[PDB]
RNA sequence: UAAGGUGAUAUGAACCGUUAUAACCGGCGAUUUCCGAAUGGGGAAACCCAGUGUGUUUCGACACACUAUCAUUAACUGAAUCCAUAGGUUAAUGAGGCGAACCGGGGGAACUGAAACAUCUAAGUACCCCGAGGAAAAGAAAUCAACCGAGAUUCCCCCAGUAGCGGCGAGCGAACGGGGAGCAGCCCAGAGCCUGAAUCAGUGUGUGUGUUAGUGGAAGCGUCUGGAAAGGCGCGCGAUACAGGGUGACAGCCCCGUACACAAAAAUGCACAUGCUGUGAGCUCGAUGAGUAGGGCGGGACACGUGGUAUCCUGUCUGAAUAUGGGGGGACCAUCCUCCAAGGCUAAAUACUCCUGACUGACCGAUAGUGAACCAGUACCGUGAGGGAAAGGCGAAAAGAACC
RNA sequence: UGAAGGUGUGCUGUGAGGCAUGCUGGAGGUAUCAGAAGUGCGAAUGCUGACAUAAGUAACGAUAAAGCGGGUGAAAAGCCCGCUCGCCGGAAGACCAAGGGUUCCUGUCCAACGUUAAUCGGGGCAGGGUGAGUCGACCCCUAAGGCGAGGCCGAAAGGCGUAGUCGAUGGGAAACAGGUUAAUAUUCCUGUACUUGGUGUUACUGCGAAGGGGGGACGGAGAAGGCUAUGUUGGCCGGGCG
């Protein structure tokens, strides 16, 4: 998913970051309620938010 | 009757703590003495 | 302004349990899991931002996890904090 | 420290011995005083802690030269 | 490369299978495959209330050692050896006794 | 590189992948909480409390960045005190802490032996302290020799338990000279000519050669015993591969390897070549290390204990000649010979192994070998420094015993 | 087609020993002639482990003390409920600091732990439980004392100490009564309060410190008076007629 993320500009980036976490949150809430059945949900936005912090730091030259 | 030990947290640790040991040489002496040995708990530092 | 990211990052779970229900029914409370560090400010802005309630007022406290045994194995699980949030009345969660 | 800043000496060990030679370990010190010496192209007193040795040093070769080598080798006077 | 795969068909060389041919369905890590029908050994499964509980005695497979199996040349009808050698830049089996590339 | 995978206990659940963004291996990057030299102040380590400046704000507040000390240099400022200096502020650069040994230096025991013990020994050992490097130290004769000559330092074998030292006791113990390893010589104390000429140090660029993932890698069947064959018997085959390990008993030919032959996008070591920067090369004429050498007093080091005691170091008091001069040749003098102190740099042969890879052993095999084959510097003991265990093996495969 | 080891038997040599073989064992062993040693154990109040003896002996930890009925349970002197009895009551009651660290509450279990049994437990397992502007800490402030930029001193390590900076056991703002949980409560709820600070208006107005002064701010003993906590009795209210 880094080369179509890497199309996308810091804003579109800033944008996706948000989305992200806020599923996080969304199946983090779930997960503990007990009505989460896809476990690995939560892996997969993890590594996403983290490809996402790592194409943003690319991106600002550090 | 009254017995040897009796424990008080601040003297404890102004005694033996991890900044009484690295205030002097011989103290840090104590220290380097510990880590060389292995030692899981290097001092009294709760 | 405590920033949305920080807010999403701060409410870790319900907690569930006889008191917390009754906390619930009898005091328009509700018991949360947050974030050790989190602070009363934080979890006040976290829940009306993504629960999307008026909140009165958060108390908080540190919970010590327990020791345990496990095939002859000692370990320790981990402290965490619960926050017992009261809504505005007439709010419903 | 009992120093000497114009020839660095310092005291050293030794022994004493005994008619029978019992050997005890002793010091020898320098025979440092502290004097304030004339600088005349700076219009001023320097005090140094100096041995009768390093005076006679500077009897020798000028307060001048003297503070320079000290100057060179970094101690401040 | 591994010369056993997943889906071949092979024929067990050593232990009480000795001779019979099936098809790997399993390749462990541990050295070991799985081979459709040949190792059997019967399980005294206890029942589990929480699932459903068909607690009985259970024939099934157990792992093999991969050394135990060979390939099974059908052309030759006898166990071969494998070899590997590249073919148009991709790198392929081949068995060894007829030098002809395996599937 | 791949047809499998999401580390272990440890099953399960939800999933990923199979021809190339699954996983796995290597190079380079990114992220890297808090404590700890710990450096914004403090502190009972992993915590408490700030200042300043940039921004942001829904006015509740939020984010980021700086802020230690010392040393050196520079700028500005600035007393008594007129010039000044001390002092103050800021900036740039560096340092500090850790690590098994080996190395240089500052200090430095006693038990013990002497059949007691004090000189002497143990021993400049143990230990404490400071500092460095991949090695360190030493090093280019004010050295030896003996009238013949050698030619810096270091290390090894002799010389030799010799000469000597020694309550001439216990003990301590050379050198000259010889055989080897290794080999290398230079600069300042200064001007002119000639000039930028060797030589190193740094930074790029190429060529090789390693290191950090990897690729291919020969050749066996039948039959007997047996739970199982790699064993017995019979007949074959490979070998620049019969090192080694595994597989249901002992396998060159089942598997992984092995001999052999190959491989690098990227980083990096070394050796050359070639660029750029600093450095100066050669000739002539000069110059030739002073509170020093030497001395008196007290100690110490020399195998050498003050002895008839040269030589070296210097705490104290003194004190030359300076090349027409001076040092040494074991008291001292003469003669002769030999060297040139009081400035400095220098590879190799040498010492060690916390750590990494490969290989080896008439080394151990669970009371042995590490204290520790196992979740051990743990449990436990102690205020603390510190002390410190016991404990390995079902089976080929869990087929780990449904059901009564 | 059964190695080492284990355990028996037979034979054999002058001895240390050797040979054969049944059973057990289930994968190693090794002639000969040479070679090397961690090469031979009953003692060392030897070292480690295992197991005896005394012995089913002494003892079961204050002589405050128990009895019975019912329950549960495989089983009840010990647990649960009840009635009675006895024991403490300036404590053997209640509540803190210190120290400990989940021992707290609920369910479940009885191997081991509990000097007996155990259905019980501070024992095993699992879940739950600690809510603060006002209580405490942190915080401001200092004592003894510690550290300590420069500094003075010392072979090195270091010693002392100035400006400072730490350091309570002391000085410094503010919340009470009632109700509530299986388990927290001056923290939750009800009712009624209080303190400090930031902002913004209004009105008036000399504000300003690292400096000055005040205050904070302080002993021992003794004597009364005025009180409250608290108790006793009456009245009052409810109940009673043994
Ligand atoms: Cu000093
Ligand atoms: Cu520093
Ligand atoms: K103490
Ligand atoms: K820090
Ligand atoms: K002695
Ligand atoms: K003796
Ligand atoms: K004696
Ligand atoms: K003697
Ligand atoms: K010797
Ligand atoms: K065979
Ligand atoms: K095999
Ligand atoms: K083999
Ligand atoms: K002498
Ligand atoms: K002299
Ligand atoms: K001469
Ligand atoms: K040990
Ligand atoms: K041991
Ligand atoms: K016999
Ligand atoms: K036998
Ligand atoms: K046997
Ligand atoms: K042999
Ligand atoms: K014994
Ligand atoms: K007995
Ligand atoms: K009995
Ligand atoms: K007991
Ligand atoms: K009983
Ligand atoms: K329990
Ligand atoms: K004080
Ligand atoms: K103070
Ligand atoms: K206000
Ligand atoms: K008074
Ligand atoms: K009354
Ligand atoms: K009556
Ligand atoms: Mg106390
Ligand atoms: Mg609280
Ligand atoms: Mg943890
Ligand atoms: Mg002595
Ligand atoms: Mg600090
Ligand atoms: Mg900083
Ligand atoms: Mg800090
Ligand atoms: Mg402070
Ligand atoms: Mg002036
Ligand atoms: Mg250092
Ligand atoms: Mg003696
Ligand atoms: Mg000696
Ligand atoms: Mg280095
Ligand atoms: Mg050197
Ligand atoms: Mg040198
Ligand atoms: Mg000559
Ligand atoms: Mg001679
Ligand atoms: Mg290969
Ligand atoms: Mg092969
Ligand atoms: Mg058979
Ligand atoms: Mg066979
Ligand atoms: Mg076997
Ligand atoms: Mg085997
Ligand atoms: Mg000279
Ligand atoms: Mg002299
Ligand atoms: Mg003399
Ligand atoms: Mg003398
Ligand atoms: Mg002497
Ligand atoms: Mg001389
Ligand atoms: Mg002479
Ligand atoms: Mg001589
Ligand atoms: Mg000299
Ligand atoms: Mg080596
Ligand atoms: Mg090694
Ligand atoms: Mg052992
Ligand atoms: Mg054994
Ligand atoms: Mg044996
Ligand atoms: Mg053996
Ligand atoms: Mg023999
Ligand atoms: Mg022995
Ligand atoms: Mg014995
Ligand atoms: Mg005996
Ligand atoms: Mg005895
Ligand atoms: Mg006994
Ligand atoms: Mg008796
Ligand atoms: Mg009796
Ligand atoms: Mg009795
Ligand atoms: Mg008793
Ligand atoms: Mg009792
Ligand atoms: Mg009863
Ligand atoms: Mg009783
Ligand atoms: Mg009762
Ligand atoms: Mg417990
Ligand atoms: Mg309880
Ligand atoms: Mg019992
Ligand atoms: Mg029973
Ligand atoms: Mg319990
Ligand atoms: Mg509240
Ligand atoms: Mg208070
Ligand atoms: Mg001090
Ligand atoms: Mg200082
Ligand atoms: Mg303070
Ligand atoms: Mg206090
Ligand atoms: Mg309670
Ligand atoms: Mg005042
Ligand atoms: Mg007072
Ligand atoms: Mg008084
Ligand atoms: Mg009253
Ligand atoms: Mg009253």
């Avoid at chain 3, 095939?71 to 320790?76: L, N, T």
Wanted: hydrophobic fraction near 35%; charge should be positive.
């Amino acid at each position: 998913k880094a080369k179509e993320l890497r199309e996308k500009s810091v804003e579109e980036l800033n944008t996706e970051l948000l989305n992200l976490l806020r599923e996080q949150f969304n199946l983090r809430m779930q997960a503990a309620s007990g009505q989460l059945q896809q476990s690995h949900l939560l892996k997969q936005v993890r590594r996403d938010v983290a490809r996402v912090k790592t194409l943003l730091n690319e991106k600002a030259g550090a | 009757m009254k017995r040897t030990f009796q424990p008080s947290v601040l003297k404890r640790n102004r005694s033996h703590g991890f900044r009484a040991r690295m205030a002097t040489k011989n103290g840090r002496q104590v220290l380097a003495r510990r880590r060389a040995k292995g030692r899981a708990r290097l001092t009294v530092s709760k | 302004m405590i920033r949305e990211e920080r807010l999403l990052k701060v409410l870790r779970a319900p907690h569930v349990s006889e008191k917390a229900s009754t906390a619930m029914e009898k005091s328009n409370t509700i018991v949360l899991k947050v974030a050790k560090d989190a602070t009363k400010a934080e979890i006040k802005a976290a829940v009306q931002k993504l629960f999307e309630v008026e909140v009165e007022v958060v108390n908080t406290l540190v919970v010590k996890g327990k020791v345990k045994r496990h095939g002859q194995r000692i370990g320790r699980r981990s402290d965490w904090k619960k926050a017992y949030v009261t809504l505005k009345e007439g709010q419903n969660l | 420290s009992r120093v000497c800043q114009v020839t660095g000496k310092r005291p050293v060990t030794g022994n004493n011995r005994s008619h029978a030679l019992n050997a005890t370990k002793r010091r020898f010190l320098p025979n440092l005083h502290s004097h304030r010496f004339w600088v005349e192209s700076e219009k001023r007193f320097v005090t140094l802690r100096v041995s009768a040795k390093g005076m006679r040093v500077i009897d020798k070769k000028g307060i001048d030269t003297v503070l320079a080598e000290l100057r060179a080798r970094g101690e401040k006077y | 490369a591994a010369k056993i795969r997943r889906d071949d068909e092979v024929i067990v060389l050593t232990g009480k299978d000795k001779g019979k041919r099936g098809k790997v369905k399993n390749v462990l890590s541990s050295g070991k495959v799985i081979v459709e029908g040949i190792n059997l050994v019967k399980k005294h499964q206890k029942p589990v209330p929480a699932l459903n509980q068909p607690g009985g005695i259970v024939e099934k497979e157990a792992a093999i050692q991969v050394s135990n199996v060979a390939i099974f040349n059908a052309a030759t009808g006898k166990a071969d050896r494998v070899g590997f050698r590249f073919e148009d830049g991709k790198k392929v089996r081949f068995f060894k006794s007829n030098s002809e590339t395996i599937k």
